[PDB]
Design a protein around this ligand. Structure first.
Ligand SMILES: *[C@@H]1O[C@H](CO)[C@@H](O[C@@H]2O[C@H](CO)[C@@H](O[C@@H]3O[C@H](CO[C@H]4O[C@H](CO)[C@@H](O)[C@H](O[C@H]5O[C@H](CO)[C@@H](O)[C@H](O)[C@@H]5O[C@H]5O[C@H](CO)[C@@H](O)[C@H](O)[C@@H]5O)[C@@H]4O)[C@@H](O)[C@H](O[C@H]4O[C@H](CO)[C@@H](O)[C@H](O)[C@@H]4O)[C@@H]3O)[C@H](O)[C@H]2NC(C)=O)[C@H](O)[C@H]1NC(C)=O
Ligand code: YB6
Ligand code: CA
Ligand code: NA
Ligand code: NA
Ligand code: ZN
Length: 806
């Protein structure tokens, strides 16, 4: 019940919402059916439109008008945004040359430059070039301020998961808005786009920017706007709030536009109908900047122009139906469209079986436009698993397609030509970023970055301490003229041991054998230097990775590679090696095929053993430093040490062997040498974070050798590829991946072909940021370079996407 019988007199768009059943006058009351009776009359005036004309100049104040052109409107803070232009001979902000804003130029009583976030729904990155003719205010913000060629959204590339990521710095799996439709089995409640359930606070996790601000005593404008409040009124409300007295005035504001997403759904991203919504957005930006200039705030306010996601071409006739694959279609609930999520229709039917649902959906038709995944097998870069609201079965849908349960769902539920929600690496889903103001750089282009990074920067812009989030604070310092945050390297928690020769061969009973007794002060002086770290500067280019947790591990040096060997996990945490452009690939000699050699630096009790692999019929083994890339026949023996061995399913060895035999050398040829760091990952609870040993769910049968869920590599080279990787004077270039360690290659529909047709395609799909590998391993990489730490943080958040150029 709301006793809507109170009044909005002097309360229009009041900043704190008043508790039921007193009636509300805040920018969200319309959404809750709870506004006072006079809200429309008082708060949504429209008389006379939004622009001053010649004849209203100096008019007698008439309180009915939407905005005012009377002489007092500046002191009252409610002129039309073009007031000074029409009635005082002033120029529009877009007509003025840009002039660097070196310092904030603020009216008295402003303690800090305000931040205004102008968020646009569906604003695809290429609109900045393609619509440039019809967006002069936006093109000025972009060319005068700081801009990226595009900004990567999070998955799924839907509206609320992305806007709430902007507000919290968290992945959707952590903030909890994981789609535009959700079931929470703990609440036993559902969230939908239409409805009042979506307003319940318990859907919304983390701490959004407005709550961070408020807790730290910075006032905030209310971010959410009811759909029927027109854009001109949203802008005028923000400008009026900007005229409040110092003690009441917010420092942070948001504007939001439903366009161009609205029209994009109907007409497609580049439909001829799309020119007008882009014109109209630009004109709204023009109103804001003219209003700020009127208030003398246009060289004081930081303005962010930011999208939530792009828009792709999608039509009714590109729909795949689960009824064309499954017979039990009525025993499932599908969340449909640009991604799929599948669960059982009833918790009381124990015949529904996820494993056979997946198998019925896997590589079933030659041109199949979706791929089913258990959520924990999705590419780790999506970070889309660790939330009870995400269903175990997921369908990644090819761009341009939908998935639906039954054809009837599509014509009885064509109507649309655009949609979004696809994989966040897809070029059509990329969106925009522009920062303009005293704290942003002048005329600067920065590389593309992910939207999870903005919350930190918005906190920096406001002098706030960010709540814990998924951004890497300092990675976007290069966007800012000042207020940068000066990160420091995490402290190493565990220091390594440097073991020497301590064990005789006969102490090992590992059931390993090698044909190596086919056995000189010239070459034994050398073996010794190699085991002391004499070639370490060649293979360890950026320092040893730091171990950020408590553990026991050994550095092991070799001619061709260096490793950090875990006495707890019985395998390396990392193995580092450099392949120059000139390197040669050799084979594994026939007599060495099954060779495994005890490492006399590491005790039997902390080594793997060969008998465990012999007795584990499902599990085989691979090596981290590959024998194919040994620098000489004698160095090759080092590659067969039991301390370089890791457990691998046979199906996985197919991938790993191709990467190591063919692709490392291809990359070294293309990139003028590479440094590779590879290693195992254990993430059995799929939370994106390194497992402790007591979380391991699978071991090599009858042993304490844990089986990894993934294997990573980080491949680093010189950004200026005229310089060799091992002799690089400036910025680095990196690509990385996190390959799932699976017992089948069901993910790859072409796997029965030659590895040259499918392996690299798999690796690309599992591309990753160094930062993702850091979370998964508790390691910190690049600790010793000649680069600034901020630059290294930007490199660690880089993602190599393999899309073509936008
Ligand atoms: C990305 O960035 C985020 C934020 O830093 C990281 O997420 C954090 O991870 C840590 C480590 O796991 C979590 O710590 C654990 O927290 C609980 C306390 O839980 C409450 O307090 C915090 C702090 O205010 C809240 O933010 C929590 O909010 C979660 O739950 C509510 C629902 O209750 C929901 O509204 C939120 O959306 C959010 O859900 C997500 O997180 C939970 C787990 O917390 C997860 O189940 C869910 O799927 C969602 O993803 C919450 O109200 C504490 O009890 C734990 O202690 C236990 O473990 C120790 C081990 O030391 C045991 O000894 C002990 O007995 C306990 O059992 C943890 O400390 C932290 O909550 C979490 N924060 C958020 C906001 O998610 C991610 O890890 C980052 N991702 C990557 C890849 O880096
Ligand atoms: C009817 C309807 O949907 N209204 C609506 C929806 C969303 C928003 C937002 C937002 C936002 C989040 C994070 C930001 F950093 C900036 C803006 C405002 N109004
Ligand atoms: Ca984990
Ligand atoms: Na052997
Ligand atoms: Na085996
Ligand atoms: Zn949309």
């Amino acid at each position: 019940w709301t006793a809507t019988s109170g009044s909005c007199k002097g309360r229009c768009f009041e900043l704190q919402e008043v508790g039921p059943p007193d009636c509300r006058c805040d920018n969200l009351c319309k959404s809750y059916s709870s506004c006072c009776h006079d809200f429309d009359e008082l708060c949504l005036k429209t008389a006379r439109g939004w622009e001053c004309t010649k004849d209203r100049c100096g008019e007698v104040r008439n309180e009915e008008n939407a905005c005012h052109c009377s002489e007092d409107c500046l002191s009252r803070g409610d002129c039309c945004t073009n007031y000074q232009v029409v009635c005082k001979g002033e120029s529009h902000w877009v007509d003025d040359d840009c002039e660097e804003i070196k310092v904030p130029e603020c009216p008295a009583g402003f303690v800090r430059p305000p931040l205004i976030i102008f968020s646009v729904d569906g604003f695809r990155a290429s609109y900045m070039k393609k619509g440039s003719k019809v967006m002069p205010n936006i093109e000025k913000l972009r060319s005068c301020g700081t801009h990226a060629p595009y900004m990567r959204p999070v998955y799924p590339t839907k509206t609320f998961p992305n806007l709430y990521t902007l507000a919290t710095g968290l992945y959707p799996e952590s903030h909890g808005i994981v789609g535009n439709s959700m079931y929470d089995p703990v609440f036993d409640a559902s969230f939908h786009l239409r409805g009042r359930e979506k307003f319940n606070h318990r859907w919304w996790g983390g701490q959004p920017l407005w709550i961070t601000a408020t807790k730290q005593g910075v006032r905030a404008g209310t971010f959410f706007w009811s759909v029927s409040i027109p854009h001109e009124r949203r802008i005028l409300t923000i400008l009026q709030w900007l005229s409040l007295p110092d003690n009441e005035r917010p420092s942070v504001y948001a504007f939001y536009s439903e366009q161009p997403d609205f029209s994009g759904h109907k007409y497609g991203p580049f439909g001829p109908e799309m020119t007008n919504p882009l014109r109209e957005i630009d004109k709204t930006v023009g109103q804001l900047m003219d209003g700020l200039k009127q208030l003398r705030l246009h060289r004081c306010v930081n303005v962010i122009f930011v999208g939530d996601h792009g828009m792709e071409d999608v039509t009714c006739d590109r729909t795949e139906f689960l009824s064309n694959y499954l017979t039990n279609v009525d025993d499932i609930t599908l969340v449909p469209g640009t991604l799929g999520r599948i669960r059982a229709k009833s918790i009381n039917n124990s015949k529904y079986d996820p494993k056979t649902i997946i198998a019925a959906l896997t590589c079933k038709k030659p041109d199949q436009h979706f791929k089913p995944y258990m959520k924990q097998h999705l590419p780790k870069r999506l970070h889309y698993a660790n939330n009870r609201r995400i269903e175990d079965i997921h369908l990644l849908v090819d761009r341009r397609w939908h998935v639906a349960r039954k054809p009837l769902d599509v014509y009885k539920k064509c109507f649309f030509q655009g949609d979004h929600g696809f994989d966040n690496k897809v070029n059509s889903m990329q969106t925009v970023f522009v920062g303009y103001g005293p704290t942003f750089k002048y005329r600067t282009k920065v590389p593309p970055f992910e939207n999870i990074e903005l919350y930190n920067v918005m906190c920096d812009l406001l002098g706030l301490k960010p709540a814990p989030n998924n951004g890497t604070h300092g990675s976007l310092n290069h966007l800012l003229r000042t207020n940068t945050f000066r990160p420091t390297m995490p402290d190493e928690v565990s220091r390594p041991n440097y073991p020497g020769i301590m064990y005789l061969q006969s102490e090992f009973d590992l059931g390993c054998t090698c044909d190596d007794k086919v056995e000189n002060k010239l070459e034994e002086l050398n073996k010794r230097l190699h085991t002391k770290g004499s070639t370490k500067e060649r293979h360890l280019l950026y320092g040893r990775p730091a171990v950020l947790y408590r553990t026991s591990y050994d550095i092991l040096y070799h001619t061709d590679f260096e490793s950090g060997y875990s006495e707890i996990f019985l395998m390396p945490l990392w193995t580092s090696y450099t392949i120059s452009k000139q390197a040669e690939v050799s084979s594994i000699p026939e007599h060495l095929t099954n060779c495994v050699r005890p490492d006399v630096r590491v005790s039997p009790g902390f080594s793997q053993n060969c008998l465990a692999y012999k007795n584990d019929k499902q599990m085989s083994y691979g090596f981290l430093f590959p024998p194919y890339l040994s620098s000489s026949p004698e160095a090759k023996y080092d590659a067969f040490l039991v301390t370089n061995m890791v457990p691998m399913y046979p199906a996985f060895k197919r991938v790993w062997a191709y990467f190591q035999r063919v692709l490392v050398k291809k990359y070294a040829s293309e990139r003028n040498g590479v440094n590779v760091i590879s290693g195992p990952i254990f993430d059995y609870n799929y939370d994106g974070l390194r497992d402790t040993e007591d979380e391991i769910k699978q071991y090599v049968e009858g042993s304490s050798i844990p089986v990894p869920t993934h294997y990573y590599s980080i491949i680093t080279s010189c950004l200026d590829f005229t310089q060799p990787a091992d002799k690089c004077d400036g910025p680095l270039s990196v690509s990385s991946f996190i390959l799932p360690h699976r017992p089948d290659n069901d993910e790859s529909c072409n796997s029965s072909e030659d590895e040259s047709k499918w392996v690299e395609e798999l690796m690309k799909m599992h591309t990753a940021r160094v930062r993702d590998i850091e979370h998964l391993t508790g390691l910190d990489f690049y600790r010793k370079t000649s680069r600034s730490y901020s630059e290294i943080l930007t490199l660690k958040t880089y993602l190599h996407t393999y899309e073509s150029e936008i």
